[PDB]
Amino acid sequence: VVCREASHAGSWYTASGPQLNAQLEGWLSQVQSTKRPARAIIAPHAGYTYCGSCAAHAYKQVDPSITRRIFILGPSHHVPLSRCALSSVDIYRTPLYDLRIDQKIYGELWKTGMFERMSLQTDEDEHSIEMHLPYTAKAMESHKDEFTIIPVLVGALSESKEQEFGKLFSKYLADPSNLFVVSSDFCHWGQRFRYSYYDESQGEIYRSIEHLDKMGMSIIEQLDPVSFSNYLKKYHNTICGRHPIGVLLNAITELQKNGMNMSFSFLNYAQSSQCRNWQDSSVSYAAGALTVH
Ligand SMILES: [Cu+]
């Protein structure tokens, strides 16, 4: 058709509009805005019942009176993708209100030939982008009729491809009217994820997970894509949105080469549970914001 349905409403977040509106409002109430206006954010894409309050720390930094085009870069979980993919529909539906895809930017991005066209089934099967639509619509409701979205599915990008896509999106990141939402959870720890790296010097397992995550968070705060690449090559932390992050980090360094000065700061860290023994498992969530100066 012409609309991507809220395919994960009911399961990953409440399908009731009034209830969803109230939940996001409540999570956003407990956050004080400190990084307005955010040029980019990093936010988790798990179920709202796990990461809702954490993701609110990122969306409170969005200034709806400034932002007009919202890029959402999410990792692919079901489709083999070596590049980036664009949607084939024109509207993304949410229980709050439906979001419009910026046709001008979609034509510019498609005309590069670096992007693939993802089918409607692939679109609705994926959740890494959709989990940010209700939060985006809520934070932008004061200007609900003046903003568009640019969905981008990010595949298994090579380091060179992360740099190429980063330089491409850098021209859009430099626009003050643009916002880049980078979707990622952090450490998936446990036997279910086949990842059990544990540094006993850090104490308990959940403290080792915390130290491992915040090492990667600090590198992001240093805006260093090469150090982030090495950190992933050294510890193999199960950060599922590492490719969108690497794309953003390269976009920042391309802007730094052109005189622009920026600062990224993480604002909330959380874990779905606190692992203490080898039979435990947890997923970490981190919310951060990028500000341009
Ligand atoms: Cu994930």
Residue numbers in the entry: 5 to 297
Reproduce, without paraphrasing, sentences from the article in which this PDB structure was first reported.
Mediator of ERBB2-driven cell motility 1 (MEMO1) is an evolutionary conserved protein implicated in many biological processes; however, its primary molecular function remains unknown. Our work reveals that the iron coordination mode in MEMO1 is very similar to that of iron-containing extradiol dioxygenases, which also display a similar structural fold.
To reveal the binding mode of each metal, we have crystallized MEMO1 in the presence of iron or copper under the conditions similar to those used previously for solving the structure of the metal-free protein. The protein fold of both metal-bound forms of MEMO1 is essentially identical to the metal-free structure, with RMSD for α-carbons of the superimposed structures being less than 0.17 Å. In the absence of iron, we have also observed binding of copper (added as Cu(I)) to MEMO1 at a molar ratio of copper to protein of approximately 0.4. Therefore, in the absence of specific copper loading mechanisms for MEMO1, it is likely to predominantly bind iron in the cytosol of the living cells, even though copper binding can be observed in vitro.
